[PDB]
């Protein structure tokens, strides 16, 4: 026949990966080079601007490494955008910019530097770096963490990066992976980046669908219709969302409702129960065998 590869000795010699590696969530090779501060810094925190894109929202946080795990200082999500004006379309490039801007301004509010480090009040789409000013406390600087995202040109991870940079965070970067950097001539024009920041590509697609096939337009965009969001006012709405975010970036926690203490999963079986089950099974098997014989 065939030799059983996963035999009793296979598990004896088997070495498991880390829990995150087995689950595939994290990349420890990049984490080592991302979270490890120099030893001569003597416990100076190193901040990573973590960006994650899910199927329905975008998570933007900043964290520093510790022996008991990372500490989340400021967390910004995309499901809270409807509080600011973006009612629908929370997983696009424009939403990535908005949540990155929200994370930056909220962090500045937490550290009490809202008025200082204004940053890009209005969008431009070109390269920009927050330059620290003398006398005033120095600017907050962190480093981008894309995780496992395949960082090509025009990624929503970089969109969140641009939003945070415009928010006032001095994150090192370059205008190479931003949408608009063409590779045939190796140059960057801010106009295309501005269109992607404001979601003009989505509006153009919306116009294209409603012009060539209305039924497919309904099939693709339906929540936009339900929220009566037309392409013409798309950029104006995002500008309003940017103004609202930069106005009131604070976060308030929802009140903790008191539970009724109801368990939703079957509790673990105990030793007595499992030792009784085999006794019942053996007794049933023999009593069935004798009466069937």
């Amino acid at each position: 026949f065939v030799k059983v590869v996963k035999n009793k000795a296979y598990f004896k010699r088997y070495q498991v990966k880390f829990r995150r590696r087995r689950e595939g969530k994290t990349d420890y090779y990049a984490r080592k080079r991302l979270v490890i501060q120099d030893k001569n810094k003597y416990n100076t925190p190193k901040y990573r601007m973590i960006v994650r894109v899910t199927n329905r929202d975008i998570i933007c946080q900043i964290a520093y490494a510790r022996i008991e795990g990372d500490m989340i200082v400021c967390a910004a999500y995309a499901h809270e955008l409807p509080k600011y004006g973006v009612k629908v379309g929370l997983t696009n490039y424009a939403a990535a910019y908005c949540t990155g801007l929200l994370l930056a301004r909220r962090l500045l509010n937490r550290f009490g530097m809202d008025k200082i480090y204004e940053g890009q009040v209005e969008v431009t789409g070109d390269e920009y770096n927050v330059e620290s000013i003398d006398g005033q406390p120095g600017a907050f600087t962190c480093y981008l963490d894309a995780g496992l995202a395949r960082t090509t040109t025009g990624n929503k991870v970089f969109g969140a990066l641009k939003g945070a940079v415009d928010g006032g965070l001095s994150i090192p970067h370059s205008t190479k992976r931003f949408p608009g950097y063409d590779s045939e001539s190796k140059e960057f024009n801010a106009e295309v980046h501005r269109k992607h920041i404001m979601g003009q590509n989505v509006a153009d697609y919306m116009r294209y669908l409603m012009e060539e096939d209305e039924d497919a337009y309904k099939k693709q965009f339906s929540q936009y219709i339900k929220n009566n969001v037309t392409p013409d006012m798309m950029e104006e709405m995002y500008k309003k969302a940017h103004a609202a975010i930069r106005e009131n970036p604070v976060y308030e926690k929802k009140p903790k409702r008191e539970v009724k203490k109801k368990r939703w999963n079957r509790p673990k079986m105990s030793l007595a129960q499992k030792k009784d089950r085999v006794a019942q099974k053996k007794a049933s098997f023999l009593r069935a065998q004798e009466r069937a014989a």
Partner: protein, 205 residues
């Protein structure tokens, strides 16, 4: 032209078996370790005796085979052709080195392999014989005769186990009646209660 056993009678050196670093070793003289009707069930051959050494010595492969032949000859003569089972529980692996002169002298003194020798510890069993209960005197005489083929001191002991098994003879039939042991030829299979119950229900089926 083989040297007397008195030369290689002491476990003088650390074990030096035939391996990737030792090539050209001549094949061991003894290659058959089981004799008689080795295709015998554990039920029909309860009695078991053992030839066990009483010193930390070295037994050559040729000595092992000579004792095996002598024991086999007596068993087939007394108990019958198909009425016993002789198992040699020592395999010669420690190869021995021979330095031969032809006037080089002691320069480059490292012997080439000459033969294979089995190293025996205190109380380790050298030979085992399994047969019926009434054939006890014949086995004792057979091993006593084979003692003369070995150097050092060896003794004959009749183990309390059931044949070539690690279970006591008195409780062996009781356990197999309780269906804790399954005969599978010259040995037995021990059935614990730690497996899935499908095996248990199949056995009790």
């Amino acid at each position: 032209g083989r040297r007397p056993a008195r030369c290689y009678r002491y476990c003088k050196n650390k074990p030096y078996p035939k391996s990737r670093f030792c090539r050209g070793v001549p094949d061991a003289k003894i290659r058959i370790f089981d004799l008689g009707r080795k295709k015998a069930k554990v039920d029909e051959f309860p009695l078991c005796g053992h030839m066990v050494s009483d010193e930390y010595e070295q037994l050559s492969s040729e000595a092992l085979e000579a004792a095996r032949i002598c024991a086999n000859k007596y068993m087939v003569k007394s108990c019958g052709k198909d009425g016993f089972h002789i198992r040699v529980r020592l395999h010669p692996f420690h190869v021995i080195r021979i330095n031969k002169m032809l006037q080089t002298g002691m320069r480059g003194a490292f012997g080439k392999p000459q033969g294979t020798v089995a190293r025996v510890h205190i109380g380790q069993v050298i030979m085992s014989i399994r047969t019926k209960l009434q054939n006890k005197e014949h086995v004792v005489e057979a091993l006593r005769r084979a003692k003369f083929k070995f150097p050092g001191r060896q003794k004959i002991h009749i183990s309390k186990k059931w044949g070539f098994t690690k279970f006591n003879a008195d409780e062996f039939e009781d356990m197999v009646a309780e269906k804790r042991l399954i005969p599978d030829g010259c040995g037995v299979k021990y059935i614990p209660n730690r497996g899935p119950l499908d095996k248990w229900r199949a056995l009790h089926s």
